[PDB]
Amino acid sequence: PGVITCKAAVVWESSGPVVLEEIRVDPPKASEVRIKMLCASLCHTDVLCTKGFPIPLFPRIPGHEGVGVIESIGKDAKGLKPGDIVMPLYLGECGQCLNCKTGKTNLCHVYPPSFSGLMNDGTSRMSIARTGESIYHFASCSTWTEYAVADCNYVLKINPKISYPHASFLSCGFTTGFGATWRETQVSKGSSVAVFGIGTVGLGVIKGAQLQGASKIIGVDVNQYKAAKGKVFGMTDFINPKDHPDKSVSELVKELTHGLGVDHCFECTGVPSLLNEALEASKIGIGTVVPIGAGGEASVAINSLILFSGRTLKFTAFGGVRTQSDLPVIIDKCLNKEIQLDELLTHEIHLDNIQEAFEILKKPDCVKILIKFLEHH
Amino acid sequence: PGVITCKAAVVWESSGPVVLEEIRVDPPKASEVRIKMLCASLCHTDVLCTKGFPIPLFPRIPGHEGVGVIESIGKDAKGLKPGDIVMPLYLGECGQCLNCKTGKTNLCHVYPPSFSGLMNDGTSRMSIARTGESIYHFASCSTWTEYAVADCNYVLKINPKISYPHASFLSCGFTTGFGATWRETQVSKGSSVAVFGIGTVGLGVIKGAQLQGASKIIGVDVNQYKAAKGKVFGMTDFINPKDHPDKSVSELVKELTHGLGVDHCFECTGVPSLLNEALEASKIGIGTVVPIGAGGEASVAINSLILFSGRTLKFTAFGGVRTQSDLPVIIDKCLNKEIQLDELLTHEIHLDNIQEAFEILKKPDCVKILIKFLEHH
Ligand SMILES: NC(=O)c1ccc[n+]([C@@H]2O[C@H](COP(=O)([O-])OP(=O)(O)OC[C@H]3O[C@@H](n4cnc5c(N)ncnc54)[C@H](O)[C@@H]3O)[C@@H](O)[C@H]2O)c1
Ligand SMILES: NC(=O)c1ccc[n+]([C@@H]2O[C@H](COP(=O)([O-])OP(=O)(O)OC[C@H]3O[C@@H](n4cnc5c(N)ncnc54)[C@H](O)[C@@H]3O)[C@@H](O)[C@H]2O)c1
Ligand code: NA
Ligand code: NA
Ligand code: NA
Ligand code: NA
Ligand code: NA
Ligand code: NA
Ligand code: NA
Ligand code: NA
Ligand SMILES: [Zn+2]
Ligand SMILES: [Zn+2]
Ligand SMILES: [Zn+2]
Ligand SMILES: [Zn+2]
C-alpha cells in the first residue's frame, strides 16, 4: 500500500475554524495499522483540542471517537489484518506490567495515554497534500479523517455485527460512565447513586447503576431535556438545580436520601464547584465520589472540612475500563441488547459539514452527534 | 458531690495568654461524669483554639488530650463509676446507627464530634470562681483543668495499669496515625509506605506500617532531629526536603521506589502544598493517600491532572479508629509492649507553667509535652 490521498478536518490555529483539507496518509510502519474510518463522533475533549488545550499542537486533525476497518498493516501488528473492524483506544493493556498484573487498574505502564500528537517514532503519517506539511493527530488516532494510522496496541478488534454508530459511542463517554459503576466504585444491589450531569457519561453511569441493582438513581442536570433520557436508562429521580436557586445540589440530594446522601456519587459535568457538591452529596463515612468530568483548570479546590468526613474520592481515567479485558465485555452487552444505545444518537452530519457540529452541540436536544463519511472510487 | 473549686488554664481572647484561673466545676448531670485529671498533653489543635479557630469561643479552657479518674457520676452513666480510669474521646461509638452497623467507619451518627464548647443541654459546667462567668470547654472534655465534666459517651474506661502519659498520647495523634494504617488504607506485607511529617502522627503511621510488614517505610521531614525517632518506630528511609531544594518531595520518593512511588502515602504535616505532593508520590493506578494533617484553610487545591491518575484519596477522622471497638485494641498493644511509646515523651511541665508549652513546642527536639497536676488537700 502506498500513500493514500483523502480528506480530513484540520484546525490550523487555536480557536480557528475546522476546515476540510486534502491530505496524504502514509502507509503503516512496524506495529501500526492504517484504518478506513466508518463513522466518528465528538465530545468536549475535541472542542478543547481546537482551542489548543491541553497542548497547542497545530495543524491538527481532531477526533478520538469512532470506528473503522483495517486497510493495511505494518509488520508485527499482533494478529490484526485487513478487513478487521477496530475501535481506537485512549490507552492499551499489555497484561504483563506491574499495574496490569494487579487487576486493580486500567492504567497500563506500557501503553499509557499519549499527548504528543505523533507516532511512536516521533513522526506523523499525515500531511497536507499541497505542501507536504506534517499534521498532528489526536490522542492515539485521529478520527475526523477518511483514513488514519494507529499503533496496533491502541486499537481494539471488535465484533463486526456491532453497529458502527454504537461502537463509536462506546469508544469514549458512555463506556467511561458505565465502567465506573463497577471498576472504580462497586455499586451494589439496593445502594443509592447520584449522577451530576446527564450527557453520554452520566447516562452510562445511570445504566451501569441500574444493571447493578441500585434502588435509587438520582440524575442532576440544569437541562430539563435530559430528564427523559435519564429515565430511559434507569434514572429514578431527577433534580434540576435551577428550580431551587437558594439550595445547593448536595442539599437537594440529601432531601431525597433521608438527610444522609448517596452511597456513590459520580461527577459527570466537569464543573469545578460541583466536585465539592458531589462530596457533600455522598454519605459521611461510607460514601464514594468518582470525578469523571474534567474542568480544564490548573487545580481544583476541595472544602478542607471534607478531609475529615471519611469519604472516598476515587480518581479515574476511562472509567477504570481495561481496554482489552473489560471493553469487549461492554461491547457484548450492547450486542446482546442488555444495554440499548439508540437514544444516544440525536444528530447526524457528514465530515464536510464538521463546522456545524460546534453549533449542534449547543442545542438542548443534543446528546451524541454521528459523523459520516463518503466513499472514494 | 457539690461544686468543686480548682485551677484551670483559661484563654480569654484570640491569641491571648493562657492564664491559670480559679474555677468552679459543677457536679455531673444525667449521663455525665466528672473527672479528676491525672495528666494532659497538647497538640496543634489546642494552639488553634487559643487563636479562636475553628470557632472563637471565649473564655475557654483548652486541652483535649489526657487521662483522668472518675470522681463522680450522674444518673445513667452506662456503668461508669467513681475510681474508673478514663480517657476523653473526640467521638463516640453507639454500635447501632447506620454507620456503626457497616463496620466501615468510625463516624458514628449518634455521637459525632462537638464544636459547641458546651454540654448536651447547652450549658457549661465550668465557671470563673470570682464572677460566675461561664467558661467554654474544648471538644468533648477540657483537659487543661484539675477537674472536668464529660458526656459518658465521650469517655473510654481503660485498663488501670496503662501508664497515664502513654494513655494521654494514645488519646489523639499517635493513635490517629497508627489506626490509619489498617482502618483507612490496608498496609500489607511487602508494601511501600511514605509518611510526610514525623511528629506523633507520623510516628504512629510508621509503627503501624512496620507491624503490618511494610518492607519500605519512607519518612519525610525538614527537621533532621526526627530521623532518629522515625528509625526507632520502624522507618527504613529518611528524606529531608531541605537537602534538595530543586527537587519535589514526590520526586525524592520516586527515586527510592524505582520511579513508581509508594503503595500508601500518609500526609501528616497539614502543609497544603504537600497534599498534592503526597498524591504524586503514590503509585499511579493503585496508590492510596490518607490526608491526616489539617492546614486550617478554607479549601485545599489538587492538581487537576491527578484526577485522571487512578489513585484513591481516603478522607478520615481520628485515623478511622472506632473509639469503643478499635481504641481498646491499640491500648492493649501498648500494655503488651507491642508498641513502645517512651520515645514520644520529650518534655514535662506542670499546669501552672502552661504558657511555656507554647515555646517548648517550637524546639527541634520536642515530640510530645506532658502536663502534670498537683493534688488538693
Ligand atoms: N471522561 C470522558 O470520556 C469525557 C469526554 C468529554 C468531556 N468530558 C468531561 O466530562 C463531562 C461529561 O462528558 P459528556 O460527554 O457526557 O458531556 P455532556 O456535555 O454531553 O454532558 C454534560 C451535562 O452536564 C450538564 N451540566 C453542565 N453544567 C451543569 C451544572 N452546573 N449543574 C448540573 N448539570 C450541568 C449539561 O447540561 C450536560 O447535560 C463533560 O462536561 C466534560 O467536562 C469527559
Ligand atoms: N489528626 C490529629 O489528631 C492531629 C493533632 C494535631 C495537629 N494535626 C495536624 O496534623 C499534623 C500532624 O500532627 P502532629 O501532632 O504529629 O504534629 P507535629 O508538629 O508534631 O509534626 C509535624 C511534623 O511535620 C514536619 N513538617 C512541617 N512542615 C513540613 C514540610 N513543609 N515538609 C516536611 N515536613 C514538615 C515538622 O517538622 C513536624 O516534625 C500537624 O502538623 C497538624 O497539621 C493533626
Ligand atoms: Na508502533
Ligand atoms: Na466509510
Ligand atoms: Na464531552
Ligand atoms: Na473527563
Ligand atoms: Na450527657
Ligand atoms: Na492528679
Ligand atoms: Na499537632
Ligand atoms: Na488533623
Ligand atoms: Zn470523547
Ligand atoms: Zn500493562
Ligand atoms: Zn491532639
Ligand atoms: Zn453509631
Swiss-Prot record, chains A, B:
Tissue: Present in non-glandular trichome cells.
Record-annotated membrane-spanning stretches: none
Compartment list: Nucleus; Cytoplasm, Cytosol
Top-level taxon: Eukaryota
Chain positions recorded as Zn(2+) 1 binding sites: C43, H64, C172
GO molecular function, one term: zinc ion binding
Root EC class: oxidoreductase
Binding residues for Zn(2+) 2: C94, C97, C100, C108
Any coiled-coil regions, as ranges: none
GO terms, biological process: formaldehyde catabolic process
Keywords: Cytoplasm, Metal-binding, NAD, Nucleus, Oxidoreductase, Zinc
Function: Involved in the biosynthesis of the antimalarial endoperoxide artemisinin. Catalyzes the conversion of artemisinic alcohol into artemisinic aldehyde.
Subunit field text: Homodimer.
Protein name: Alcohol dehydrogenase 1
Gene that encodes it: ADH1
